[PDB]
């Protein structure tokens, strides 16, 4: 490493467009209703469960709630979309292809 | 086949053959003279 | 073209003159023995082909032909199993009544009273109750006869002769050049598309045409002699159409993409056959078709001789980030130039695969009447788990061998390997910390519970009653897979396993598989597993990363991969070698997998396996894993001491060999401790005091007696330790589960 | 009648689509590979192979794109059969 | 100097050479309210020496264990202070010989 | 393919720390610099008081909720607070004897700040500084244990 003498402070080359665009690229397809959810959506059912579990705020969700499935799947896709958007943006600006 | 019989004279091959022989002799002795606890014959 | 067949013609003369010269492959062993250390080194260096020569071509040729030898030996072994099933078996009797007849395929000769081992297994037969699962595998293949097993044995012997001929041919007659081995793209294309794709497709075809009809008739109560032979099902489409109506339509639905017509024999039922307790062979056939297509498309991924495909070098050299520097640059050369790197990766994944196989074959029993043969199930899990652990430790070993021998810092500058070696201290420090944290918060829980139970404070234990450590993530995953056919796998009729939840499948009154409930004891023992795994990883990864150099010894690569020490200096540098890190990782893999298989045995005997006498399941041990596996004294009392009553009381039975091997494995294990606790300097002096007595009587050998090298002392010790422990567990498990299951 | 079916037309459309995409510079061919960024660039071809086309479209290209279009059409046919749109 | 042209050895800068750095320390004098700092500099005035602190620790710990054995264990209602509350395992010596 | 993140420490590739996001991210560096351990100009007694308050308050929870008297309603909190007081006392003892053992050799090399300017050694790392630091730790830790009990008694939503 002939470069990197002082650990640049901008180690994450931040683009504020990246989180917004990953969020919109995931949640908008996640707002498409499909046959498997009974016509509903993943984000729709996730927010529905968020509401149903905020109706008793202290009491957390159960093991049999289905809020955890929506949570984990939604955030799998969302984190993947956000990190791949950051990677793609900073590879486009930089080299990498 | 001088080299092959030199191979068969090696320590592991000769040991295998000799112990197969000894074990077979003991096994046949114990088949034809079963359960020899004492020398009585 | 670049991808082509390239061979040397008659490189090596087929001659016996080097058989008669032991140690020809080495320049340090060709000089003949003067000490017995030569006799040991001749066997330690026999297959270290990279220490015989240094050019990769002859190494690769030796490796190829030795693989052919291994395949020929495996074929001999398989033909022997099939032949013993054809000649020394109760298989035809077992097909007619698999729920009462114990599978046996080994008969003992009546010579020294050992005909007591020829036990009453059933079917008018006397022999050794086997635990290999070969009967269930043969019934799944649709054998139904000893003649078919005999001809499979003959075919296996023919294929073994073919493999040995091929080794001789590809070493001595037409041996491939180095550029032929380095065609990794074509090798992967053929091994994915052909070895795994065409192989899975051919097995799918066998299952479509032989296994499925034969087993559908076997499950319909048809006696195996009334069942049509496989060729009658191949020739007569009317019989297959009578069993599966989609065969009336032919192969037209396949080419017209009307694949749903084949839903008679290509299903997605999931769960288990309620008649056999095994997987639906229609699901299995569809599975093999699917993965055949998958591997056949996967084997068209790499670029060999036409423009289409990938260059793996490009993929690697393109995968780099801001954290990893140059990235995977220089790994294609590593893995096309070093056999030990490939062996490391391949052994790692093969052992992980064997363990995955173990975990997936008990939960989704793929063979008929396998789930209720509790001995077969336990033995298969234990066996493949052990093979996997051994392969993983070997992966560590050969990664270290690569790092010592084949690593070059010129080809690795600021790439992933350089950057891993450059922060090895952080890796190993955090691994050490997590190992200590896991050891505490896993085993100290058991110690806390033992102390509380001994103190008379069961309300202070980490139990399902007092202080619940519930594995809620695993419980959630269980519930999610159980409810998959409802939401997330709607075309599946049932879940993959009954272990997720639901009802039990009872075959012959015995439980084939039933839901496994996870509680505090399961939490504790899974964290024990994680702990032991992390420590094994610690030892092996420390041997890999510190194979070339350390803060203690900076020139460790010049000492080699396999050296005893550097000396008693620096306070003492014993076992700084990477070989010694493998030597210790073996002990820790043993300690890990022993608990793995103990957890499996107890969990199965307590919460899954058992009989359905009335409406209600009576488990083998009685469901005591939940309340007794919280303590070490529970594992000692309710598992080791209790379940040993079948192996120590087996004298006078057909299981007496298991008690004998129990005791003998104890003996071998303790005998390992003479080599592990001791050192070479005592034994050389004892040997010279004995050599005095031999010189006095003029029987002093010319090959001077030496003590075993330090490395060989450690190797003998760990080998005897593993053998004794594993055979002790083997005898204990088998004597227990043949009796109670 | 299969010839004229929805399946048949889907399959011929998919195969001809992949063939026309490769032949007319819209898909990677034997002569044109792609970089890490999906831009078509000349390949080295690893053997050299002769074709009289104006574009160097090999029968290897016809095989590759027939397989790709057959996969595309099979997936499309069976997914429209899955969602009930066929 | 020490960062000029990969010159990571300086005899006049042995701090940068040996890596003697305060990676996170800040020498700012201002952290706490001065009345609070006064309160806590005076609260510890008596025990700010090793001997005084160890005297406090000895006194407190010995007093604590003694009052715990005399009073605190019984206040905690410990089973060792309550006694068996039963005839105990007195007459059941062994399974064979039921000894007292 | 520019912009590598992980750098050698202060640009010195032979000291061996490898500055990294977890090490030298400005949020992380800021948070760790603002901790009383790294306030090298502040009196060690007051940094000890803060550290001790924090630790005495935090290590009472385990003794309260997981101790041997955790299932007795009003006795759980008292027993846990007293266990924490004892542990804080032991820790003050250990701190004192560490100050006695460690600070006898008086290192001679100076310190810098990853920027070039040499700073004075932390007075904490002397005999007197560590003794007053341990006094502060004892005072603050007993105070924080007492405050942990007070919070058991006065916080609305304490279970
Ligand atoms: C600041 C928000 C907040 C607050 C105050 C609480 C507070 C509480 N939670 Mg909740 N919880 C939260 C966020 C929060 N949780 C989130 C983000 C998740 C995810 C959960 C999941 C969760 C579960 C699964 C459970 C609780 C439970 C509890 C209680 C004991 C812990 C307590 C009332 C437990 C309870 O009492 O029920 C319980 O079982 N929580
Ligand atoms: C993994 C390979 C394997 C193993 C471990 C065994 C093991 C055994 N075989 Mg089998 N066998 C095998 C492969 C194998 N076989 C194959 C490939 C064939 C076909 C050629 C046979 C054909 C065969 C026959 C025909 C018989 C055995 C018998 C035996 C037993 C005694 C053999 C003996 O005394 O050797 C003697 C060795 C020397 C004298 C040297 C033993 C359990 C015998 C048996 O079980 O009798 C009841 C017996 O009669 N084997
Ligand atoms: C009769 C046929 C024949 C002959 C004369 C030779 C002759 C030779 N070979 Mg070739 N070879 C043959 C067959 C033959 N080979 C076959 C069939 C294979 C395929 C496996 C090979 C593969 C091969 C390789 C890869 C190499 C040779 C080498 C050699 C040379 C010396 C080998 C040596 O020391 O042998 C004595 C060795 C043995 C007798 C060991 C045999 C081990 C067998 C294969 C496995 C048995 C395992 C056994 C079941 C384990 C039981 C365990 C026990 C506890 C029960 C010599 C030129 C070596 C060389 O350097 O050539 C220049 C070399 O590297 N050969
Ligand atoms: C479709 C083509 C194909 C197939 C099926 C295989 C299959 C295999 N190869 Mg591979 N290989 C291939 C192409 C193929 N290879 C190409 C193109 C190259 C050059 C790059 C290599 C280079 C290569 C090396 C360097 C090695 C292998 C090895 C192996 C064996 C691994 C062990 C195993 O899985 O046991 C499964 C066992 C079976 C499925 C039993 C059936 C075995 C059949 C008879 C052989 C497969 C057909 C053969 C490749 C074609 C020639 C036929 C012959 C009559 C002329 C396996 C048999 C390893 C090995 O063990 O060597 C012996 C090994 O070291 N191969
Ligand atoms: C490798 C796997 C495999 C194999 C070998 C077979 C083989 C077969 N299947 Mg099966 N099948 C498979 C996978 C497989 N299938 C899978 C995965 C599925 C699910 C989609 C099916 C579904 C399925 C159905 C639904 C049906 C079959 C049928 C058939 C048979 C008809 C073959 C046919 O019409 O194709 C045509 C094949 C050929 C034309 C190749 C023959 C070429 C010969 C060997 C050339 C040799 C000539 C030589 C050079 C000269 C002579 C030599 C000498 C005398 C001189 C045949 C036995 C049908 C049947 O009748 O079953 C009983 C049937 O109805 N299969
Ligand atoms: C695909 C599997 C595979 C392959 C191809 C290799 C290949 C190799 N290994 Mg690796 N290795 C493997 C798996 C593998 N190993 C596993 C699983 C382990 C963990 C146990 C190791 C651990 C290991 C170490 C620690 C070392 C090697 C070494 C070697 C090299 C020479 C080995 C030799 O000459 O032994 C020849 C064969 C023997 C000496 C026989 C050993 C017999 C064992 C100890 C007894 C077990 C037999 C039986 C199961 C027990 C019952 C027997 C009964 C009679 C009582 C060679 C490159 C050595 C090397 O490269 O040196 C630089 C080396 O130091 N390997
Ligand atoms: C526009 C045309 C079209 C349409 C309508 C469909 C429609 C469908 N496809 Mg098809 N498909 C198409 C084109 C199309 N596909 C093409 C071009 C290809 C080739 C790449 C495929 C390859 C393909 C495969 C290989 C599979 C489908 C499957 C499916 C079905 C469910 C997929 C799903 O929800 O999984 C939901 C899956 C998840 C939410 C996560 C899966 C995560 C995996 C398991 C872990 C990695 C659905 C009926 C599936 C099917 O037939 O099942 C019945 C299936 O396995 N498709
Ligand atoms: C699993 C947690 C990984 C955490 C993670 O997300 O890392 C991801 C991060 C990604 O690095 P790059 O994007 O530079 O890697 C590019 C790849 O092509 C590999 O070169 O990997 C590292 O920084 C090195 C590994 C750190 C390992 C830290 C262990 C804690
Ligand atoms: C068990 C065993 C045995 C036996 C085995 C066997 C018997 C096997 C077989 C195998 C086989 C018997 C195989 C076969 C295969 C086949 C195949 C693999 C086929 C394929 C096909 C394809 C791939 C196709 C393609 C296509 C189509 C689809 C149409 C037209 C066009 C084309 C042609 C392109 C022995 C004795 C060795 C011993 C050991 C064990
Ligand atoms: C002469 C010429 C012409 C015409 C031509 C033509 C017309 C051609 C055609 C061609 C074609 C028409 C081709 C085709 C191909 C095909 C293929 C190649 C196929 C393949 C298949 C496959 C590969 C399969 C696969 C699979 C299966 C089997 C199952 C499922 C899955 C998968 C998909 C994988 C022109 C223009 C006029 C001009 C001049 C030249
Ligand atoms: C016991 C022991 C020995 C002594 C073991 C001896 C040297 C090996 C004995 C192997 C066999 C018994 C000798 C082989 C002799 C012939 C090959 C056998 C053929 C004839 C038989 C029928 C007798 C060591 O040299 C040693 C070295 C380093 C650490 C621990 C130890 C250690 O524990």
Automatic annotation (TrEMBL), chain A:
Annotated binding of chlorophyll a 2, by residue: 97
Binding site for chlorophyll a 1: 75
Name assigned to this protein: Uncharacterized protein
Organism encoding this protein: Chlamydomonas reinhardtii (Chlamydomonas smithii)
TrEMBL record, chain F:
Subcellular location: Membrane
Chain residues that bind chlorophyll a 4: 50
Family: Belongs to the PsaL family.
Highest taxon above the source species: Eukaryota
UniProt entry tagged with the keyword Cell inner membrane: no
Annotated residues for binding of chlorophyll a 3: 37, 55
Binding residue positions for chlorophyll a 1: 31, 37, 55
List of residues binding chlorophyll a 2: 31, 55
Gene Ontology BP, a term: photosynthesis
Membrane topology according to the record: Multi-pass membrane protein
The protein, known as: Photosystem I reaction center subunit XI, chloroplastic
Alphabetically ordered keywords of this record: Membrane, Photosynthesis, Photosystem I, Transmembrane, Transmembrane helix
Entry's Gene Ontology cellular component terms: photosystem I reaction center
Shown part of the complete sequence: 38 to 196 of 196
Domain (Photosystem I PsaL reaction centre subunit XI): residue spans on this chain: 6-155
């Amino acid at each position: 490493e002939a470069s990197n003498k002082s650990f640049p402070r901008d180690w994450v080359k931040t683009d504020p467009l990246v989180p917004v665009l990953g969020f919109a690229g995931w949640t908008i397809p996640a707002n498409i209703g499909v046959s498997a959810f009974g016509g509903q959506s993943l984000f729709g059912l996730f927010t529905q469960s968020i509401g149903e579990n905020l109706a008793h705020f202290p009491t957390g969700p159960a093991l049999d709630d289905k809020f955890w499935l929506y949570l984990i799947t939604y955030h799998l896709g969302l984190f993947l979309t956000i990190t791949l958007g950051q990677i793609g943006v900073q590879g486009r600006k930089q080299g990498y292809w | 086949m001088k080299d092959f019989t030199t191979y068969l004279s090696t320590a592991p091959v000769i040991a295998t053959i000799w112990f197969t022989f000894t074990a077979g002799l003991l096994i046949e002795i114990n088949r034809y003279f079963p359960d020899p606890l004492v020398f009585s014959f | 073209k670049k991808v082509k067949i390239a061979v040397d013609r008659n490189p090596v003369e087929t001659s016996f003159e080097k058989w008669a010269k032991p140690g020809h492959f080495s320049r340090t062993l060709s000089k003949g023995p003067n000490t017995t250390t030569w006799i040991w080194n001749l066997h330690a260096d026999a297959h270290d082909f990279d220490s015989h020569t240094s050019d990769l071509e002859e190494i690769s040729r030796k490796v190829f032909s030795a693989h052919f030898g291994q395949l020929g030996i495996i074929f001999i072994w398989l033909s022997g199993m099939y032949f013993h099933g054809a000649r020394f078996s109760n298989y035809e009797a077992w097909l007619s009544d698999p729920t009462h007849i114990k599978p046996s395929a080994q008969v003992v000769w009546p010579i020294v009273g050992q005909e007591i081992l020829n036990g009453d297994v059933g079917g008018g037969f006397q022999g050794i109750q086997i635990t290999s699962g070969f009967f269930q595998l043969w019934r799944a293949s649709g054998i139904t006869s000893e003649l078919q097993l005999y001809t499979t044995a003959i075919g296996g012997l023919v294929m073994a002769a073919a493999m040995f001929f091929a080794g001789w041919f590809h070493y001595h007659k037409a041996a491939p050049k180095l550029e032929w081995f380095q065609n990794v793209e074509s090798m992967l294309n053929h091994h994915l598309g052909g070895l795994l794709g065409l192989g899975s497709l051919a097995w799918a075809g066998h299952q479509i045409h032989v296994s499925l009809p034969v087993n559908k008739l076997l499950d319909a109560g048809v006696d195996p002699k009334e069942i049509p032979l496989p060729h009658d099902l191949l020739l007569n489409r009317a019989i297959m159409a009578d069993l599966y109506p989609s065969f009336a339509k032919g192969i037209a639905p396949f080419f017209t993409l009307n694949w749903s017509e084949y839903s008679d024999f290509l299903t997605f039922k999931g769960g288990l056959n309620p008649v056999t307790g095994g997987l639906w062979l229609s699901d299995t056939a569809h599975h093999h078709v699917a993965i055949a297509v998958l591997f056949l498309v996967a084997g068209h991924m790499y670029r060999t001789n036409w423009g289409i495909g990938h260059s793996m070098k490009e993929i690697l050299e393109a995968h780099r980030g801001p954290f990893t520097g140059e990235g995977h640059v220089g790994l294609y050369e590593i893995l096309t130039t070093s056999w030990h790197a490939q062996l490391a990766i391949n052994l790692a994944l093969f052992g992980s695969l064997s363990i995955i196989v173990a975990h997936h074959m008990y939960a989704m029993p793929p063979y008929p009447y396998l789930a209720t043969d509790y001995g077969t199930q336990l033995s298969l899990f234990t066996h493949h788990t052990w093979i996997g652990g051994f392969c993983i430790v070997g992966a560590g070993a050969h990664a270290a061998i690569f790092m010592v021998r084949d690593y070059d810092p010129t080809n690795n500058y600021n790439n992933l390997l350089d950057r891993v070696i450059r922060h090895r201290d952080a890796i190993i420090s955090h691994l050490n910390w997590v190992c200590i944290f896991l050891g505490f918060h896993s085993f100290g829980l058991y110690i806390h519970n033992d102390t509380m139970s001994a103190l008379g404070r069961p309300q202070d234990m980490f139990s399902d009653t007092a202080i619940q450590l519930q594995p809620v993530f695993a419980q959630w995953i269980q519930n999610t897979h159980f409810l998959a056919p409802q939401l997330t796998a709607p075309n599946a009729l049932a879940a993959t396993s009954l272990t997720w939840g639901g009802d039990l499948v009872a075959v012959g009154g015995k439980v084939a598989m039933m839901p496994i409930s996870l509680g505090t004891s399961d939490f504790m023992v899974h964290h024990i597993h994680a702990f032991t795994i992390h420590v094994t990883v610690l030892i092996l990864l420390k041997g890999v990363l510190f194979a070339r150099s350390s803060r203690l010894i900076p020139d460790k690569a010049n000492l080699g991969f396999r050296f005893p020490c550097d000396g008693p200096g620096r306070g003492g540098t014993c076992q700084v070698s990477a070989w010694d890190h493998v030597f210790l990782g073996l002990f820790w893999m043993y300690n890990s997998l022993s608990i793995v298989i103990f957890h499996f045995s107890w969990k199965m005997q307590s919460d899954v396996w058992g009989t359905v006498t009335a409406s209600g399941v009576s488990h083998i041990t009685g469901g005591n894993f939940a309340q007794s596996a919280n303590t070490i004294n529970g594992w000692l009392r309710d598992f080791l001491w209790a379940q040993s009553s079948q192996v120590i009381q087996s004298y006078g039975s057909a299981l007496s060999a298991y008690g004998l091997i129990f005791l003998g494995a104890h003996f071998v294990w303790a005998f390992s401790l003479m080599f592990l606790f001791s050192g070479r300097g005592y034994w050389q002096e004892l040997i010279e005091s004995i050599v005095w007595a031999h010189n006095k009587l003029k029987v002093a050998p010319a090959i001077q007696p030496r003590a075993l090298s330090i490395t060989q002392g450690r190797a003998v010790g760990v080998a005897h330790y593993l053998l004794g422990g594993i055979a002790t567990t083997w005898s204990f498990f088998l004597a227990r589960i043949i009796s109670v299951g | 009648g299969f010839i004229g079916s929805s399946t048949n037309l889907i399959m011929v459309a998919s195969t001809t689509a992949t063939l026309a995409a490769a032949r007319f510079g819209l898909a990677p061919t034997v002569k044109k590979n792609t970089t890490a960024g999906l831009k078509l660039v000349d390949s080295k071809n690893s053997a050299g192979v002769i074709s009289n086309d104006p574009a160097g479209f090999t029968i290897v290209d016809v095989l590759a794109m027939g397989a790709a279009g057959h996969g595309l059409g099979v997936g499309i046919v069976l997914g429209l059969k899955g969602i009930g749109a066929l | 100097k020490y960062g000029e042209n990969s010159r990571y050895f300086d005899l006049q800068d042995m701090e940068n050479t040996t890596g003697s750095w305060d990676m996170y320390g800040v020498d700012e004098k201002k952290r706490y309210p001065d009345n609070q700092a006064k309160f806590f500099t005076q609260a510890t005035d008596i025990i700010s020496r090793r001997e005084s602190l160890r005297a406090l620790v000895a006194l407190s710990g010995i007093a604590a264990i003694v009052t715990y054995g005399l009073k605190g264990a019984k206040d905690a209602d410990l089973p060792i202070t309550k006694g068996p509350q039963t005839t105990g395992e007195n007459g059941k010596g062994g399974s064979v010989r039921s000894r007292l | 393919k520019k912009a590598q993140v992980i750098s050698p420490v202060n640009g010195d590739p032979f000291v061996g720390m490898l500055e990294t996001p977890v090490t030298s991210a400005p949020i992380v560096a800021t948070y760790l610099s603002n901790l009383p351990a790294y306030r090298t100009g502040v009196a060690p007694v007051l940094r000890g008081v803060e550290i001790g308050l924090a630790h005495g308050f935090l290590l009472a929870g385990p003794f309260i909720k997981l101790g041997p008297l955790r299932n007795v309603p009003e006795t759980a909190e008292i027993a846990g607070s007293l266990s924490a007081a004892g542990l804080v006392l032991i820790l003050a003892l250990c701190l004192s004897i560490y100050g006695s053992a460690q600070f006898q050799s008086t290192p001679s090399i100076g310190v810098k700040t990853l920027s070039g300017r040499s700073v004075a050694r932390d007075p904490l790392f002397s005999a007197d500084g560590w003794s007053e630091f341990a006094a502060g730790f004892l005072v603050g830790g007993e105070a924080g244990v007492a405050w942990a009990y007070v919070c058991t008694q006065i916080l609305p939503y304490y279970s």
